[PDB]
Amino acid sequence: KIFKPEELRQALMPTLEALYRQDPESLPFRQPVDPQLLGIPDYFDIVKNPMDLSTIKRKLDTGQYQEPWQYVDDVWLMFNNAWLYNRKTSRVYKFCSKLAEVFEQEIDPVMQSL
Numbered sequence: 001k002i003f004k005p006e007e008l009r010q011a012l013m014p015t016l017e018a019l020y021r022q023d024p025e026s027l028p029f030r031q032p033v034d035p036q037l038l039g040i041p042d043y044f045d046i047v048k049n050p051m052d053l054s055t056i057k058r059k060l061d062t063g064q065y066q067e068p069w070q071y072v073d074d075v076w077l078m079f080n081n082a083w084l085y086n087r088k089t090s091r092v093y094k095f096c097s098k099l100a101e102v103f104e105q106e107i108d109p110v111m112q113s114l
């Protein structure tokens with residue numbers, strides 16, 4: 001099956017908005033990590049493929065996903081980066097785990113619909 005860009009935007013953007021709606025848990029993920037601003041200069045030594053909500057939103061808006069699993073892969077890349085980099089006790093790690101729970105719930109019926 002071939003997916004049209006607007007078909008993917010209509011189906012998948014509500015699942016991304018559900019992540020943005022999470023406060024405080026989406027706040028670390030709304031913009032690309034800025035290591036110098038945050039004072040964490042080792043970040044890019046650990047995380048080789050950064051990803052965040054704003055970049056996913058732009059990719060959906062500009063038709064960069066041909067198939068829904070590419071979108072799912074980027075959302076999970078964002079999660080995996082945060083579980084890799086941050087300590088298990090940290091806000092960003094526990095907030096990431098919450099976003100993963102919300103995403104799992106939202107994406108499943110959408111994928112069934114296609």
Ligand SMILES: CC(=O)N1CCc2c(c(N3CCCc4cc(-c5cnn(C)c5)c(C(F)F)cc43)nn2C2CCOCC2)C1
Binds near residue numbers: 039040082
């Ligand atoms: C996604 C990822 O891996 N980041 C790398 C580490 C990281 C990120 C962030 N970010 C990115 C910028 C926005 C932001 C906002 C919040 C927030 C929540 N509730 N409120 C009211 C605000 C939090 C959360 F912590 F309070 C973290 C971050 N900080 N950190 C480290 C946090 C500890 O000091 C060093 C920086 C993003």
